[PDB]
Amino acid sequence: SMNKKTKLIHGGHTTDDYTGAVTTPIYQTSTYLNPTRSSVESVIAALENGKHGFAFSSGVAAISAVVMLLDKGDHIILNSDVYGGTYRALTKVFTRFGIEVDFVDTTHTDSIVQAIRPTTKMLFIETPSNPLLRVTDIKKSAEIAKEHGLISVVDNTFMTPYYQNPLDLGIDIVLHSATKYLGGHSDVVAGLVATSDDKLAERLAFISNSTGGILGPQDSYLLVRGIKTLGLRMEQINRSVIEIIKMLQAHPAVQQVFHPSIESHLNHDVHMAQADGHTGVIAFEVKNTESAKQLIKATSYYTLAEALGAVESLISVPALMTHASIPADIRAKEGITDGLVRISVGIEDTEDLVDDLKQALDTL
Template sequence: MKTKTKLIHGGIPSDQQTGAVSIPIYQVSTYKQDGIGGHKGFEYSRTGNPTRHALEELIKDLEEGTAGFAFSSGMAAITAVMMLFNSGDHVILTDDVYGGTYRVMTKVLNKLGIESTFIDTSNLSNIETAIRSNTKAIYIETPTNPLLKITDIRGASNVAKEHNLLTIVDNTFSTPYWQTPLNLGADIVLHSATKYIGGHSDVVAGLVVVNSNQLAEDLHFVQNSTGGILGPQDSWLLIRGIKTLGIRMEEHEENTKQIIEFLQSHPGVEKIYYPGLSSHPNHNIAKKQVRGYGGMISFDVGSEEKAEQLLKQVKYFTLAESLGAVESLISVPAKMTHASIPKERREELGITDGLVRISVGLEDMEDLIADLANALKG
């Protein structure tokens, strides 16, 4: 089954009870049993809900894994995955991760004794150097947020296997339409499904897919025990959003290519970050592991003042957190998504106060370019 077909017919494509072509929203908390333990696959909606189950089966199929799990947010998904580890365990993470990931590792999970080290995983030798006797996993974002750095998933997974470590990949920016990390050797893939998978700025959710029955059993135990589940209405919204993921991702990318051509020719833009550019670090790695480069661009306009001026002038790019929606969004990571990272750490990573991140939407490309051209006049 080809990917666009799988987006529509994967998982549980219709309701087996009624034949409805859209899985119903099972707004229910508990289920009648014929006798003690005699339920029909569902007993309590924290443990399992038919609508959520349909979503979990769908994302499992799209990522080509063993089992899928739906959580109430991307951060709930990340936290649940980290609950697979014990106090005293150590996790290596990409240095340029989403600010919320950095925050939960350094301000919350560290209190539970889960240790973390942040390194540039785009250089595989750094991973080897960072491994300790108590290291249990390598956590990769690729492309990263906001500098769109690329890590070799297969290479990192090979290093992990040599040391009996898990490989975890945040696949939010690429989605399973453009990249399938489990096929490259990863053990766990996760998403902030709030972004491209939902695609319409109307749901907050997280998704996880694992590649083994043991990981599936362990993560379901965490999900059921801690309860950070996705509700049935939001599960239904994600199923609906996924049906158009393919055509949306293709259109996002087509608009992005033309916007990049404009930015490259503009004197007010000092640097552009986009993995589809041949000049982008590890572009050749990206070519091997993705089927498309996505709709995220970061570019530096040189100063905080110029960035703020740009944000004041845009009309079609909405100043807002998040990304991956049908509408184009714009932000300054240093002041918004990555504000929780200390300034000295941001500067060390290259997240300057003049760095602007745009999530290219589905508006007419000519309108988007005209909007940026007007805003960059200063």
């Protein structure tokens, strides 16, 4: 009944019953004879149509807690292009604890069915993924997980709860790196987890309380605050994304463009069926690493950084920053060419962002 933008302002419990304060008090305290974190947990639960919310000290900490739902010998399926925090955690930490990991191209859901082993207990899916924005069918993944008794998990960071709600599609657990869009201001490191399953929430509550990766009260407050403008920020970002893609597809100096809004993008129709907007992450190819380096230097409004989901627009070259550790020829196979540029669209004026990127591409 509440339209989305209204729910962001009035959903969850973010006021103080004791005094009537319209914002949640910051409970910088360790002993009662934490309500600020509880407030942010109720916000993420409401936004994702879940029953239970959990706030961790980082997105990495959220993923670590969810993975610890498993035991030694259990097996997890993940989409084949997981990298960064999540890939390194699973393969360099949790495999030392007997957790077995298999990477599977989930863009075809029957790949999931083939990879299911007797010891499989979890299916973990990012959609869209980083950096090429591969799309996985959430609803079909949920059905497969239910039929085989797997805990289903979606990393919903890139879409945010404003545009995609995996719990409504039958997923067990939805999680976020709230460091990105949710906080939205490049000033809180946090992770968020929501579920509707009472037994899974109890196990999460136990894991959290026993490994202690909790989000502090000041960060909880800044996170609730940033979420208030989530809808306004993603809608501005979405307007710029559409215009930017039109420009990129027309520009001579640009080759392939990667974004789920493009009709020829693999599983474009799947993305439109499970989401009503788009992420602000876009990847596209210029000629080579030298053109990529020239493009970055020629923009006025794009800031060179690896982050995403800021109010400012960000630009990076995956092959030189996030993926420079993979050998070159393997980068080629996976599509991370030397001319691949990734942008995170911010909330600057749309025309300013279109024209700035275009005049910079014109110097190529």
